[PDB]
Amino acid sequence: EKTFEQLHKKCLEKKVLYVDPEFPPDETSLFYSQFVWKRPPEICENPRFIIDGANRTDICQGELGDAWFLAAIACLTLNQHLLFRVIPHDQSFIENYAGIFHFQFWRYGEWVDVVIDDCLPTYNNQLVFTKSNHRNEFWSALLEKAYAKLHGSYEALKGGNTTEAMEDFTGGVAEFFEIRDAPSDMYKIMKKAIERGSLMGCSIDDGYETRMACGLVRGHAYSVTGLDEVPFKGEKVKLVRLRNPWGQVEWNGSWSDRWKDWSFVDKDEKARLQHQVTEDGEFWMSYEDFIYHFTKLEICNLT
Ligand SMILES: [Ca+2]
Ligand SMILES: [Ca+2]
Ligand SMILES: [Cl-]
């Protein structure tokens, strides 16, 4: 067991790029039961670890069913100071680059360091697994690789629970809600949770194209990224903001991006709500419609 510092320092002196003996760039690391592995400098001219900050737009699901995990990362980015425990800032392609990176996860009641080489699965020189909106940003793809290593393979990330990942990023305690049994004050419970920095997911119980007619997807982890109140036509309306970790496929009901009655909303209020018409996976919906469609709500509470 050599540490990140040690391995990094060594590779720099040797002038060699690191290769992970524990989790090598071959089919063992992909599955337990076809892609070319490439490092980000082999993929593009000017790769970067973090560009314009690490935020939820940098998490876009690829050809692997790990939404449960990605939704949790996206939630984590809403709490930057927690985020930078999981992701060390002092990492770069343009300075002290030795093809090695690391991340931290809460496991067994303590922080543990996962080290990886920066080889990533590609096809036609593009990432097949999770990537960022920005073709040159690689933190999220690398984090996913590190989480895969922690579970033994990329395939091991197929299916899982959002709360598992939330706990692995925070060391917090999971709390579940069946939205049918929801208390009267659950908007308030969720509001206090988001303001306290707690991570929130939700889903529609089951038992890449738009699944439902309303634009939601069944059996799919969504990140809760906002809760707010807007006064519209005299009265105040409770809203919920969600993000689909696909980065695509939004709700189309009231308060959706292209909803016309956004025109009746004040221009400053729009700004406070960060309302944009963009196919980014993120959308506002009414608290009412939210409680009506979603069935499970998962909150990971901190200390
Ligand atoms: Ca970014
Ligand atoms: Ca949107
Ligand atoms: Cl960089």
Q: In this structure, are residues 145 and 77 in contact, taking their beta carbons and an 8 Å threshold?
A: no
Q: Determine the distance separating the centroid of ligand 2 and the alpha carbon of 215, expressed in angstroms.
A: 12
Question: Does one domain contain both 118 and 157?
Answer: yes
Q: Determine the distance separating the centroid of ligand 3 and the alpha carbon of 13, expressed in angstroms.
A: 20
Question: Does one domain contain both 104 and 237?
Answer: no
Q: In this structure, are residues 193 and 301 in contact, taking their beta carbons and an 8 Å threshold?
A: yes
d(CA 94, CA 7): 18
d(CA 198, CA 166): 9
Q: What per-residue string of b and e applies to 32-43 under the rule 16 or more CB within 10 Å gives b?
A: eeebebbbbbeb
Q: Determine the distance separating the centroid of ligand 1 and the alpha carbon of 43, expressed in angstroms.
A: 18
Side-chain half-sphere CA neighbours of 104 within 13 A: 16
The number of angstroms, rounded, from the C-alpha of 195 to the middle of its chain's C-alpha atoms is: 19
CB burial of residue 138 (10 Å; 0-12, 13-18, 19+): buried
Q: Determine the distance separating the centroid of ligand 1 and the alpha carbon of 4, expressed in angstroms.
A: 24
Closest Cα to residue 62, out of 247, 238, 221?
A: 247
Question: Does one domain contain both 133 and 182?
Answer: no
Question: Does one domain contain both 281 and 215?
Answer: yes
Question: Does one domain contain both 205 and 100?
Answer: no
d(CA 301, CA 37): 38
d(CA 246, CA 119): 23
Location of structure tokens 């738009």: 210
Closest Cα to residue 60, out of 123, 143, 125?
A: 143
What DSSP assignment string belongs to the chain? ---HHHHHHHHHHHT-----SSS-SSHHHH-----EEE-HHHH-SS-BS-SS-S-GGG-B--SS--HHHHHHHHHHTTSHHHHHHHS-S---SSSS--SEEEEEEEETTEEEEEEEE--EEEETTEESSSB-SSTTB-HHHHHHHHHHHHHTSSGGGSS--HHHHHHHHH--EEEEEETTS--TTHHHHHHHHHHTT-EEEEE--------STTS--TT--EEEEEEEEEEETTEEEEEEEEE-TTS-----STTSTT-GGGGGS-HHHHHHTT-----SSEEEEEHHHHHHH--EEEEEE--
- Classify the phi-psi angles of 270: left when phi > 0, otherwise alpha if psi is within -120 to 50, otherwise beta: alpha
Domain boundary among 145, 171, 197: 171
Location of structure tokens 């070319």: 36
> In Å, how far are 36, 55, 157, 220, 221 from 160, measured between CA atoms?
26, 22, 7, 11, 10
Which residues fall inside 5 Å of ion ligand 2, going by CB? 257, 278, 280, 282-283
d(CA 292, CA 31): 38
CATH value at residue 192: 3.90.70.10
Method: X-ray
Q: In this structure, are residues 216 and 256 in contact, taking their beta carbons and an 8 Å threshold?
A: no
Question: Which residues are registered as beta bridge partners of 284?
Answer: 241
Q: Determine the distance separating the centroid of ligand 1 and the alpha carbon of 56, expressed in angstroms.
A: 8
Domain coverage including residue 15: 1-171
Closest Cα to residue 93, out of 58, 43, 56, 132?
A: 43
Closest Cα to residue 5, out of 91, 87, 75?
A: 91
Give resolution in angstroms: 2.8
- Encoded amino acid at 198, one letter: S
Looking at the CA of 244, name the nearest ligand.
Answer: 2
Domain boundary among 117, 140, 171: 171
Q: Determine the distance separating the centroid of ligand 3 and the alpha carbon of 43, expressed in angstroms.
A: 14
The number of angstroms, rounded, from the C-alpha of 172 to the middle of its chain's C-alpha atoms is: 17
Domain boundary among 171, 192, 219: 171
d(CA 302, CA 173): 6
Other beta carbons within 10 angstroms of residue 124's beta carbon come to 6
Q: Determine the distance separating the centroid of ligand 2 and the alpha carbon of 247, expressed in angstroms.
A: 9
Q: In this structure, are residues 208 and 238 in contact, taking their beta carbons and an 8 Å threshold?
A: no
Q: Determine the distance separating the centroid of ligand 3 and the alpha carbon of 60, expressed in angstroms.
A: 19
Looking at the CA of 77, name the nearest ligand.
Answer: 1
Question: Does one domain contain both 69 and 179?
Answer: no
Q: Determine the distance separating the centroid of ligand 1 and the alpha carbon of 32, expressed in angstroms.
A: 32
Q: Determine the distance separating the centroid of ligand 3 and the alpha carbon of 87, expressed in angstroms.
A: 13
The number of angstroms, rounded, from the C-alpha of 95 to the middle of its chain's C-alpha atoms is: 26
Q: Determine the distance separating the centroid of ligand 1 and the alpha carbon of 178, expressed in angstroms.
A: 33
d(CA 131, CA 120): 10
Q: Determine the distance separating the centroid of ligand 3 and the alpha carbon of 49, expressed in angstroms.
A: 4
Q: What per-residue string of b and e applies to 231-263 under the rule 16 or more CB within 10 Å gives b?
A: ebeeeebbbbbbbbbbbebbbbbbbbbebeebe
Question: Does one domain contain both 136 and 183?
Answer: no
